[PDB]
Write an enzyme that holds these catalytic residues in place. Structure first.
Site, PDB file in Angstrom:
ATOM      1  N   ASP C 293       0.843  -1.187   0.000  1.00 28.63           N
ATOM      2  CA  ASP C 293       0.000   0.000   0.000  1.00 28.63           C
ATOM      3  C   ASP C 293       0.880   1.239   0.000  1.00 28.63           C
ATOM      4  O   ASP C 293       2.074   1.176   0.303  1.00 28.63           O
ATOM      5  CB  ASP C 293      -0.967  -0.002   1.194  1.00 28.63           C
ATOM      6  CG  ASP C 293      -0.288   0.296   2.530  1.00 28.63           C
ATOM      7  OD1 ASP C 293       0.899   0.686   2.578  1.00 28.63           O
ATOM      8  OD2 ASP C 293      -0.970   0.116   3.559  1.00 28.63           O
ATOM      9  N   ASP C 295       1.335   4.850   1.719  1.00 30.29           N
ATOM     10  CA  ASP C 295       1.007   5.522   2.967  1.00 30.29           C
ATOM     11  C   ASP C 295       1.288   7.013   2.825  1.00 30.29           C
ATOM     12  O   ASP C 295       2.404   7.406   2.470  1.00 30.29           O
ATOM     13  CB  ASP C 295       1.829   4.925   4.111  1.00 30.29           C
ATOM     14  CG  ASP C 295       1.570   3.437   4.309  1.00 30.29           C
ATOM     15  OD1 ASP C 295       0.397   3.009   4.310  1.00 30.29           O
ATOM     16  OD2 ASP C 295       2.554   2.678   4.410  1.00 30.29           O
ATOM     17  N   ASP C 350      -3.483   4.723   2.157  1.00 31.45           N
ATOM     18  CA  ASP C 350      -3.767   5.134   3.525  1.00 31.45           C
ATOM     19  C   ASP C 350      -3.493   6.624   3.666  1.00 31.45           C
ATOM     20  O   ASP C 350      -2.421   7.100   3.280  1.00 31.45           O
ATOM     21  CB  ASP C 350      -2.916   4.342   4.519  1.00 31.45           C
ATOM     22  CG  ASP C 350      -3.141   2.849   4.416  1.00 31.45           C
ATOM     23  OD1 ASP C 350      -4.034   2.432   3.648  1.00 31.45           O
ATOM     24  OD2 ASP C 350      -2.419   2.090   5.095  1.00 31.45           O
TER      25      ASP C 350
END
Ligand SMILES: Nc1ncnc2c1ncn2[C@H]1C[C@H](O)[C@@H](COP(=O)(O)NP(=O)(O)OP(=O)(O)O)O1
Ligand SMILES: [Mg+2]
Ligand SMILES: [Mg+2]
Lengths: 55, 51, 426, 51
Positions: C293, C295, C350
């Site tokens: 992912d 961030d 995120d």
DNA sequence: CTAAAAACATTCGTTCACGTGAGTTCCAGTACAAGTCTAGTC
DNA sequence: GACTTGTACTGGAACTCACGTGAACGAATGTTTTTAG
């Protein structure tokens, strides 16, 4: 070492006065760069004593 | 009270009992003198060597 | 002297004055050259009833006061002197006569690439297997051992290079033995081949599925991914989203996707509000070329402005038509599944919003690795007695925050050398 | 009692000596006397001989 | 010649130093149990 | 699994006691040799 008046000495102290007892006299004489012996010996110059105890 | 020795009393080669030995009377000796350093009066170790 | 090529010296500390005099007199009567006082002419020295180390300590102290270039005398035991006296000549000399890796990971840098890939991978696999059983302590200690191996300056090939390393007990040492001596370790291969490990690993890769849920499914008889899709009624929204796009999220995220995501998000942040700043944290900030992912951290230079940025950016992005899953569909955190153009792919993103005062704390909390963050928090609370979290540093004694204007101040005030993100890889 | 408990060497006997000339120390008060009786009983049960 | 003064030889008691077996107890060493392991949001 | 803290158990060493062995000094006595009256 305030001053050098004793140089090499084998002073023996047994019983000091009430005002300056043994703890206050041993370091006092040591300050003059002497030697302290708890008992007398052949090299001892003199033995210092106050009250005349058994020793 | 302290037993001098726990010994073995043998009435035979097989009949055996255990006994204790005590000294009800023992000579009183003055405490053993010790050696001290004259200059500052401290104990000094004693060592013996053979060469 | 009748032996110009031999010089001997004696030592007072242990030999004794009487023994000194007796030995010196006997040696002189036997013609040996005995020195009354230590001098550069001395070639050998005799030590009695003393360990070698102390003898060295005796030599160094004497050598520090000697002119440079003087050859140090040979240190010997009284046995040599006795043998020489017995034989009457110098007997030939033989053998008889003649901070570091701190436990806390916050002190030892751990570059991204190391020279112990196999051992670190085996330890990580063991940690994952232990965690699958719910034993958090075993997972933590195995992760710590793996991190310790990662920080080794040089490759480990001999067992002897495992004593000073901390967090290395019986189990880790035995695993390293099995790895180094033979190759594939029996325990590592056994646990890897265990079907429980494989099924738990497969389930855990599903977004919204944790260790507890994976274990529950294991005990319920679901041994493959198909059974999950057979009954889509016990799966929550997170699990449904993860399973629907499992293949897309399984592929690792590359840096190109990271740059595209950042470029897309910058426009949304600007539209929500101008003057805002976005920083890339996580593994990518540490230099990783792959990940799961992206961030991000959003902050504003002013203090009171950072109030409700995240909802606005989230709504703007949703209006864009890129969000597939949203955590909530006031908040300051959200993880989503973006729809990046490719066709398209699903990538986890995120977003975190923090004030400028707390910006360095959140940046530090998100850049460093999970194990590094845990170790840093433990060190802060145990050694320095301060509570460290993603919001700030707190002193229980003096009820006042210890905020700072720069991230480096966090390391400076904790009594630790500064590290860059690249070296914080566990 | 605290002084007795402070030492660590095994005690064969624990004795307390009371040197006083006050037959009735706590005459005006009564609760203090009862506390004294309770403490003396506790000491006696503990294994301390008071004379 | 003579006895007496000095020197020499012997045995005993006391002191001390060392070595060693036996009983008591004090303590360093070992074993084992229990707690800890990051912090927060939702 | 690795570390830390706290509690309980336990065999070895320190201490004491007693005896044996050997070495040294001095007291008291007896005996021998030498020298002045
Ligand atoms: N249990 C935890 N405790 C403390 N901090 C944590 C944490 N988990 C994550 N963080 C903090 C520290 C983490 O660096 C940061 C990023 O979280 P991720 O995206 O879940 N893990 P990463 O980015 O490192 O790997 P990848 O690149 O494959 O995504 O969040
Ligand atoms: Mg990440
Ligand atoms: Mg993340």
């Amino acid at each position: 070492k305030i001053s050098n008046i004793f140089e090499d000495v084998e002073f023996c102290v047994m019983s000091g006065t009430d005002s300056q007892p043994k703890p206050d006299l041993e370091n006092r004489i040591a300050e003059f760069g002497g030697y302290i012996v708890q008992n007398p010996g052949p090299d001892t110059y003199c033995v210092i004593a106050g009250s005349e105890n058994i020793r | 009270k302290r037993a001098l020795s726990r010994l073995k009393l043998k009435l035979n080669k097989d009949i055996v009992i255990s006994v204790g030995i005590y000294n009800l009377v023992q000579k009183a000796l003055k405490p053993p003198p010790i050696k001290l350093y004259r200059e500052t009066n401290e104990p000094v170790k004693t060592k013996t060597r053979t060469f | 002297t009748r032996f110009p090529g031999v010089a001997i010296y004696l030592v007072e500390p242990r030999m004794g004055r009487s023994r000194r005099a007796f030995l010196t007199g006997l040696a002189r009567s036997k013609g040996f050259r005995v020195l009354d006082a230590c001098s550069s002419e001395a070639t050998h020295v005799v030590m009695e009833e003393t360990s070698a180390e102390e003898a060295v300590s005796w030599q160094e102290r004497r050598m520090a006061a000697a002119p440079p270039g003087c050859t140090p005398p040979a240190l010997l035991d009284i046995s040599w002197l006795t043998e020489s006296l017995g034989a009457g000549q110098p007997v030939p000399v033989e053998c008889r006569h003649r901070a570091w890796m701190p436990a806390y990971a916050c002190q030892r840098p751990t570059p991204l690439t190391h020279h112990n890939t196999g051992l670190s991978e085996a330890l990580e696999i063991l940690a994952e297997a232990a965690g699958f059983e719910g034993s958090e302590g075993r997972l933590l200690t195995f992760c710590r051992a793996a991190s310790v191996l990662k920080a080794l300056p040089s490759p480990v090939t001999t067992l002897s290079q495992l004593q000073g390393l901390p967090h290395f007990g019986e189990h880790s040492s035995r695993v390293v033995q099995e790895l180094l001596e033979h190759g594939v370790c029996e325990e590592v291969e056994r646990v890897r081949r265990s079907e429980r490990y494989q099924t738990m690993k497969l389930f855990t890769q599903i977004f919204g599925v944790g260790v507890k849920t994976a274990d529950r499914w294991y005990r319920e008889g679901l041994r493959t991914l198909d059974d999950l899709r057979e009954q889509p009624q016990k799966l929550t929204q997170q699990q449904k989203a993860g399973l629907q796009h499992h293949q897309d999220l399984s592929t690792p995220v590359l840096r190109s996707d990271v740059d595209a995501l950042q470029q897309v998000v910058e426009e949304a942040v600007g539209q929500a509000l101008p003057g805002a700043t976005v920083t890339l944290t996580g593994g990518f900030r540490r230099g990783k070329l792959q990940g799961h992912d992206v961030d991000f951290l959003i902050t504003h230079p002013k203090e009171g402005q950072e109030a409700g940025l995240l909802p606005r950016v989230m709504c703007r992005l949703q209006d864009q038509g890129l969000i597939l899953y949203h955590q909530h569909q006031a908040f300051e955190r959200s993880f989503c599944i973006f729809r990046l153009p490719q066709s398209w792919k699903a990538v986890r993103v995120d977003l975190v919003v923090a004030p400028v005062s707390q910006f360095p704390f959140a940046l530090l909390g998100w850049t460093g690795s999970k194990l590094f963050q845990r170790e840093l928090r433990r060190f802060s609370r145990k050694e320095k007695g301060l509570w460290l979290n993603s919001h700030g540093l707190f002193d229980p004694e003096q009820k006042t925050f210890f905020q700072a204007a720069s991230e480096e101040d966090i390391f400076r005030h904790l009594g630790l050398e500064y590290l860059p993100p690249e070296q914080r890889n566990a | 009692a605290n002084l007795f408990s402070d030492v660590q060497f095994k005690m064969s006997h624990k004795r307390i000596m009371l040197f006083t000339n006050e037959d009735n120390p706590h005459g005006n008060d009564s609760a203090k006397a009862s506390r004294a009786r309770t403490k003396a009983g506790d000491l006696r049960d503990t294994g301390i001989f008071l004379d």
